[PDB]
Scaffold this active site. Structure first.
Site, short mmCIF file in Angstrom:
data_model
loop_
_atom_site.label_atom_id
_atom_site.label_comp_id
_atom_site.label_asym_id
_atom_site.label_seq_id
_atom_site.Cartn_x
_atom_site.Cartn_y
_atom_site.Cartn_z
N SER A 217 0.82 -1.20 0.00
CA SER A 217 0.00 0.00 0.00
C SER A 217 0.85 1.25 0.00
CB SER A 217 -1.01 0.00 1.11
OG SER A 217 -2.04 0.93 1.00
N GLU A 350 -9.50 -6.21 -3.63
CA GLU A 350 -8.91 -5.09 -2.90
C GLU A 350 -9.97 -4.21 -2.23
OE1 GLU A 350 -5.80 -4.09 -2.41
OE2 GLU A 350 -4.54 -5.36 -3.69
N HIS A 470 -7.76 -5.84 0.52
CA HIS A 470 -6.56 -5.06 0.76
C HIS A 470 -6.00 -5.38 2.15
CE1 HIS A 470 -3.84 -1.85 -0.11
NE2 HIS A 470 -4.21 -1.12 0.93
#
Length: 569
Positions: A217, A350, A470
């Protein structure tokens, strides 16, 4: 915005307590001393729940504490010491709002890194893996209750976890050249950490000519920035971008006017003048600034999908330590890092990360009526009402809206693309036009379990939510205080072995394939080629399988928004 329940806050508190005891049980009485350019450090041997052991050095400074007049400024090299520096305990994390309790925590004195290895004197110098943590440039740490080296130290590598300044303390930016706050202090911290590693990893059994940088990320955007900037040219030799890169919309922002806003939030009275604003911010208590940061963005900025008020930015003037002199897409054209082996990937759902946010704000799903708010900002008009913008929005809507009216899952799917897949695609295509031909491999993380988890699941209120969100992959790379010993035959354990195995393999050779990794027998993992119309990835589930990226169809629909503006794609 991510609001954790009372029930979970309590489960967390007891987990924190239980972890103090586990950590004690796992600390041995064997300490050891290693040399560094700046002086001796004392580390300690630790054990894991799998009965492995490793040497642990935490709290190694790579820069001066950025306090007093160093606040907001580029990092300065650390001062050497005689004697032995104690590195048997962790240091403070960067000032931030605790992602679970909602209280401010951490300290301005946070510029440290930690080094781990199962053998301080290997026959041959080992691959060095440097992890840069994510957290939107606003949260995160290198504490082992979050990022424990326990899985990686099964492998013969050196693993290093760095910290860097977060939030306004790391990413304030002022136009006035006289002030020497151009921005990107937190990225300059990363650069200085990388320099320490280059020049010191050999003392820990590491090979300075085989360094791999990776992050997830914001940590992936950071890794990418480290591959883009001239400051780090030739410093490392492989990169892994996990669920992000520098051209993601959330990965940079022009935040020069927001310092004034933050000051006004904190009680500043006077004109919008960089000098006056800076001196007010310089005397503010750090926790006060960080506490107010959530209020900085305007309604219009949030509507237009600006996610954070302070982040990586294009520096308004050049300095010797400048990290980002141009927009990242322009930096790609010249990037030294285009020429090192690279692996990139995302999870299979995600956008599932946004589950709890949609719960709190169900009106968000109505944005899919026209999808205009998700049209890339460069293409959209100010009010997002222009006929071309509605046409672009219609393309996005056709890609993600399943029935007559949009659903929550449609929104989350769209998010996967807006925040992750589309910028990945743009990056790959742009890079292909400016690279020495060095390989890029793609993976797709697609392994779902509720038997082993990580703290982000608590932060996103994702307990019991099926699908690979995610951050879900981190569970198989790093120990955390919510983890437990898994049976060697468990699918979870096998996944830990596979993920750390592939990462270590890639770190060693710049090629992620190995027949020494269980499940990788009928796998032929070829890198993406410029001429490829469709991307192939290694899909990682209970089995390892090469497939066409399932997201490709949608990715091409996003690309079609740029048909009359190819120069911006």
């Amino acid at each position: 915005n991510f609001n954790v329940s009372l029930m979970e806050k309590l489960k967390w508190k007891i987990k924190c307590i239980e972890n103090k005891f586990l950590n004690y049980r796992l600390t041995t009485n064997e300490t050891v001393v290693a040399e560094t350019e700046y002086g001796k450090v004392k580390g300690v041997k630790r054990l894991t729940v799998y009965d492995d052991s490793y040497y642990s050095f935490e709290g190694i400074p790579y820069a001066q504490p950025p306090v007093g007049e160093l606040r907001f400024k580029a990092p300065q090299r650390p001062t050497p010491w005689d004697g032995v520096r104690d590195c048997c305990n962790h240091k403070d994390k960067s000032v931030q709002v605790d992602f679970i309790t909602g209280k401010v925590c951490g300290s301005e004195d946070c510029l440290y890194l930690s080094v781990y290895t199962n053998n301080l004197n290997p026959e041959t110098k080992r691959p060095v893996l440097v992890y840069i943590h994510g957290g939107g440039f606003i949260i995160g740490e290198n504490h082992r209750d979050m990022y424990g080296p326990d899985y990686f130290i099964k492998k013969d590598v050196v693993l290093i976890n760095i910290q860097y300044r977060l939030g306004a303390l790391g990413f304030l930016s002022l136009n006035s050249e006289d002030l020497n706050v151009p921005g990107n202090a937190g990225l300059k911290d990363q650069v200085m950490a990388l320099r320490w590693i280059k020049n010191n990893c050999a003392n820990f059994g590491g090979n300075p000519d085989n360094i791999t940088v990776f992050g997830e990320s914001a940590g992936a955007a950071s890794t990418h920035y480290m591959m883009l900037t001239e400051q780090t040219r030739g410093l490392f030799h492989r990169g892994i971008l996990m669920s992000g890169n520098a051209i993601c919309p959330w990965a940079n922002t022009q935040c020069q006017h927001r310092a004034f806003t933050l000051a006004k939030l904190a009680g500043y009275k006077g004109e919008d003048n960089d000098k006056d604003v800076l001196e007010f911010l310089m005397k503010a208590k750090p926790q006060d600034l960080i506490k107010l940061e959530e209020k900085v963005l305007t309604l219009e900025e949030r509507t237009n999908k600006v996610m954070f008020p302070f982040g990586p930015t294009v520096e308004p003037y050049q300095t010797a330590d400048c990290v980002l002199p141009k927009h990242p897409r322009e930096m790609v054209k010249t990037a030294w890092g285009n020429s090192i082996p690279t692996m990139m990937g995302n999870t299979s759902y995600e956008g599932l990360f946004f589950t709890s946010i949609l719960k709190q704000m169900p009106l968000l799903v109505k944005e899919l009526e026209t999808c205009v708010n998700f049209v890339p900002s460069e293409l959209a008009d100010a009010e997002r009402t222009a006929p071309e913008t509605l046409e672009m929005g219609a393309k996005i809507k056709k890609a993600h809206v399943t029935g007559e009216t949009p659903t929550a899952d449609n929104f989350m799917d769209l998010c996967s693309h807006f925040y992750f897949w589309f910028p990945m695609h743009r990056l790959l295509q742009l890079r292909f036009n400016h690279t020495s031909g060095t390989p890029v491999y793609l993976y797709r993380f697609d392994f779902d379990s509720e038997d082993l988890i990580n703290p982000y699941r608590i932060m996103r209120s994702g307990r019991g939510v099926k699908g690979v969100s995610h951050t879900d992959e981190l569970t198989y790379f790093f120990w955390n205080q919510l983890a437990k010993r898994m049976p060697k035959e468990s699918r979870e354990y096998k996944t830990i072995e596979r993920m750390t195995g592939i990462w270590t393999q890639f770190a060693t050779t710049g090629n992620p394939y190995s027949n020494e990794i269980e499940g990788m027998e009928n796998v032929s993992w070829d890198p993406i080629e410029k001429s490829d119309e469709v991307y192939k990835c290694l899909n990682i589930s209970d089995e390892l399988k090469m497939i066409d990226v399932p997201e490709m169809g949608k990715i091409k629909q996003w690309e079609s928004m740029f048909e009359k503006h190819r120069d911006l794609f």
